[PDB]
RNA sequence: CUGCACGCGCGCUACACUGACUGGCUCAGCGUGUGCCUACCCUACGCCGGCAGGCGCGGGUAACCCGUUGAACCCCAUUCGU
């Protein structure tokens, strides 16, 4: 409570503020091209993005 | 064009308390003064207008007199001030480049002051540990036995 | 001035691993250079016998009507 | 008369207290100067205000009461030279006396975070 | 407003396409859903649901 | 009005933009305009790489995803009332066309 | 082996200027072990023998300086 | 014959031009010339004394090839190999404040001039005299 | 989580003269770059400083600007000599 200081530690620069896009991790994420997904999350939709492999 | 040798060649010199070798040349024999390094040497000699190829036992003791005198206090012969060692010294406020056991005087006086008011830096000097924030779990085992 | 014998020139390339080098040999009078500078004026200095080598083993005489100049990238 | 041998940067403490904030960076070293270049925030005012409360209500020839604080980012400033601070370590409030020496350090240097090593003999490990 | 790069446009609709495919799977699970097909236009864009049992939507 | 227009086209897939290339080629040249050809700007391949495993156990494998985007580009000259029949002679979900502004 | 004969004595300077141009191959790596000198004064003394015209210059390289005798016949 | 600078052995062409500026002492040497250290990846002062004349000679040749090189471009072209010691080496950009004061040094002699966008070219004064001495060192090379 | 009487595992430098310095001199490719939310991007140029850097002024959402990516090793000239 007492909103003077509740979320006061500045969520800005730094990986405690960057998060996973899919369901809210903050570890191993991919900020490349502005995708914002953690490494585990990215593989499932892999094709769903469009990143096909060599084949 | 030093062809044979002169009749005088100082085998070893004697500058403040360290008998510097006469065998080495000028810029790399006065590095052996504990306080004058390899880069501070070249500033002094190029202020001194000496031969930077001659060797140490090959000049008169008026020539060595001019070299020591320039490095004795460097501020007053057009030498800049983020070049010296004791820049803005924390007991006097002065700028100096120190050459001798006085450098070792000002060395340990830094350490005991960190020990006397008990800063965290000095306890690591009172102990045999690494001071500048490294690990010690896996490195420097033969500090102790 | 394009009067006497224009456009008797071919442009021929050779490649090793990244280095494309294409010479525009004209008809002329024995003038060989690379990027402006000549072929005795080159930087590795131990390989003088391996870049004016086609002038060496074939000869200066047979190729004295040609004006080879080279660009390198 | 009533004298001891001392000198700090050609500037004795008898002219340190009557000296502005902005020219204390002319004395202080580089990292302390960047801190004073930037904003001493409100919790840094709040400690020195209680210190200004502590010096004035001092009994004679006597320490102020110790002040428990939790920051350990503060430059040791001349406005509380000679005061009794209490600085947090991880577990306790270590009781520290300020003095003329250390003006150029912080308040984490005087309340150690770890307790130093003592001993050691190999048990299961060190094969 | 200001406009971003092509390398972040193609991932932006690549990641747009995945998200509604996730939710419509979560929404139309019971129907024989089977995917999407999207057409982006500078007009009314046209999403289509390939549901087998088309009544239940 | 009279203009100077540039139409762009790019996609993930190549075979679809090969046809959209030639279709606007014939779609100006059936109305006998003047075209400069499909300029071959190089292909942009981005090769994001992940460690393929959810945990730390394995024998240190890696996978290399990549997406090659192809892009081609064509000028014309014609007035921009017919930007609609430049737009609406192909629908094609997987292509992204742009037309540069026609102030010449 | 430790820093011997810096700045020549007379006892061996004659031993230089009697027979050091007689040698087939003359090189600072050769006189550095024949005499007792620690280098770098050969290279001053060898260049002045070149400055007179005793030895003739062959190699001229930034770490390998090689000369020879006077061509007798 | 009609001879340029490109067909001249340029590792000693610079030695000719630095001897030219040494006898023609109209170039301005800055006062900090032996407290300089020259692009901090290196760890001694130079063994030469009039290195500013031979640094001016080298920045003349590099600018003759590429017209339109700024001061940061002049740091790019001398930059070398920084040895960190216990850490692996890297590339180091050159020295700005001695490349700027050497372009201001050629500014005083009027061998250099400023360009339309960013950059610097050389005046027709600057290319008339070094091509003159480029053949002069090439005809002395032959002799 | 970095605490050090100690043990072990990937890895970086060196033990030189086939090199270390100093100064010349030179030739690459892959690729990334200002954000719906998220506010911090690559930077050329110019003028200040021995150096990190500071200042205004401009491009770049990109085969457009950085960028003919003047990379290193190496080449060569001096100094250094077991
Ligand atoms: Mg050895």
From Swiss-Prot, chain D:
Gene Ontology, cellular component aspect: cytoplasm; cytosol; cytosolic ribosome; cytosolic small ribosomal subunit; focal adhesion; membrane; nucleoplasm; nucleus
Keyword Cytoplasm included in the entry's annotation: yes
Chain positions of cross-link Glycyl lysine isopeptide (Lys-Gly) (interchain with G-Cter in SUMO2): 99
A GO molecular function held by the record: DNA binding
Pfam families xrefs: Ribosomal_S19 (PF00203)
This protein's record includes keyword Ribonucleoprotein: yes
Origin superkingdom: Eukaryota
Compartmental location: Cytoplasm
Record-linked PROSITE patterns: RIBOSOMAL_S19
Gene Ontology biological-process annotations: cytoplasmic translation; liver regeneration; osteoblast differentiation; positive regulation of signal transduction by p53 class mediator; ribosomal small subunit assembly; ribosomal small subunit biogenesis; ribosomal small subunit export from nucleus; rRNA processing
Keywords, in A-Z order: Acetylation, Cytoplasm, Isopeptide bond, Ribonucleoprotein, Ribosomal protein, Ubl conjugation
HAMAP family tied to this protein: Ribosomal_uS19
Known partners and oligomeric status: Component of the small ribosomal subunit.
Family: Belongs to the universal ribosomal protein uS19 family.
Task of the protein: Component of the small ribosomal subunit. The ribosome is a large ribonucleoprotein complex responsible for the synthesis of proteins in the cell.
Protein name, entry field: Small ribosomal subunit protein uS19
Organism (species): Homo sapiens (Human)
From Swiss-Prot, chain E:
Outcome following mutation: residue 17 to R: No effect on sumoylation. Abolishes sumoylation
Positions of modified residues (Phosphothreonine): 41
Function comment: Component of the small ribosomal subunit. The ribosome is a large ribonucleoprotein complex responsible for the synthesis of proteins in the cell. Has endonuclease activity and plays a role in repair of damaged DNA. Cleaves phosphodiester bonds of DNAs containing altered bases with broad specificity and cleaves supercoiled DNA more efficiently than relaxed DNA. Displays high binding affinity for 7,8-dihydro-8-oxoguanine (8-oxoG), a common DNA lesion caused by reactive oxygen species (ROS). Has also been shown to bind with similar affinity to intact and damaged DNA.
Modified residues (N-acetylalanine): 1
Quaternary context: Component of the 40S small ribosomal subunit. Identified in a IGF2BP1-dependent mRNP granule complex containing untranslated mRNAs. Interacts with HNRPD. Interacts with PRMT1; the interaction methylates RPS3. Interacts with SUMO1; the interaction sumoylates RPS3. Interacts with UBC9. Interacts with CDK1; the interaction phosphorylates RPS3. Interacts with PRKCD; the interaction phosphorylates RPS3. Interacts with PKB/AKT; the interaction phosphorylates RPS3.
Location within or outside the cell: Cytoplasm; Nucleus; Nucleus, Nucleolus; Mitochondrion inner membrane
Protein name in the entry: Small ribosomal subunit protein uS3
Highest taxon above the source species: Eukaryota
Record gene name: RPS3
Signal peptide: none
Modified residues (Phosphoserine): 5, 34
From Swiss-Prot, chain F:
Name of this chain's protein: Small ribosomal subunit protein uS10
The organism's place on the tree of life at top rank: Eukaryota
This protein's UniProt keywords: Acetylation, Cytoplasm, Isopeptide bond, Phosphoprotein, Ribonucleoprotein, Ribosomal protein, Ubl conjugation
GO molecular function, one term: RNA binding
The keyword Phosphoprotein belongs to this UniProt entry's keyword annotation: yes
Post-translational modification: Polyubiquitinated by ZNF598 via 'Lys-63'-linked ubiquitin chains when a ribosome has stalled, initiating the ribosome quality control (RQC) pathway to degrade the potentially detrimental aberrant nascent polypeptide. Deubiquitinated by OTUD3 and USP21, antagonizing ZNF598 activity.
Phosphoserine modification, residue list: 78
GO annotation, cellular component aspect: cytoplasm; cytosol; cytosolic ribosome; cytosolic small ribosomal subunit; extracellular exosome; membrane; nucleoplasm; synapse
The protein's role, per its UniProt record: Component of the small ribosomal subunit. The ribosome is a large ribonucleoprotein complex responsible for the synthesis of proteins in the cell.
Record-linked PROSITE patterns: RIBOSOMAL_S10 (PS00361)
Lineage, top ranks: Eukaryota, Metazoa, Chordata, Craniata, Vertebrata
GO biological process, one term: positive regulation of signal transduction by p53 class mediator
Family of this protein: Belongs to the universal ribosomal protein uS10 family.
InterPro entries the UniProt entry points to: Ribosomal_uS10, Ribosomal_uS10_CS, Ribosomal_uS10_dom, Ribosomal_uS10_dom_sf, Ribosomal_uS10_euk/arc
Organism per entry: Homo sapiens (Human)
UniProt-listed SMART domains: Ribosomal_S10
Subunit-level organization: Component of the 40S small ribosomal subunit.
Gene name per UniProt: RPS20
Modified residues (N6-acetyllysine): 19, 60
From Swiss-Prot, chain G:
One record GO biological process: translation
MF annotations from Gene Ontology: RNA binding; structural constituent of ribosome
UniProt KW keywords: Acetylation, Cytoplasm, Ribonucleoprotein, Ribosomal protein
GO cellular component: cytoplasm; cytosol; cytosolic ribosome; cytosolic small ribosomal subunit; extracellular exosome; nucleolus; nucleoplasm; nucleus
Source superkingdom: Eukaryota
N6-acetyllysine modifications at: 1, 10, 18, 24, 52
Location relative to the cell: Cytoplasm
Residues found modified as N6-succinyllysine: 10, 52
Oligomer status and interactors: Component of the small ribosomal subunit.
Family the UniProt entry places it in: Belongs to the eukaryotic ribosomal protein eS25 family.
The protein's role, per its UniProt record: Component of the small ribosomal subunit. The ribosome is a large ribonucleoprotein complex responsible for the synthesis of proteins in the cell.
The protein's name in its UniProt record: Small ribosomal subunit protein eS25
Gene from which this protein is expressed: RPS25
Full-protein interval shown: 43 to 115 of 125
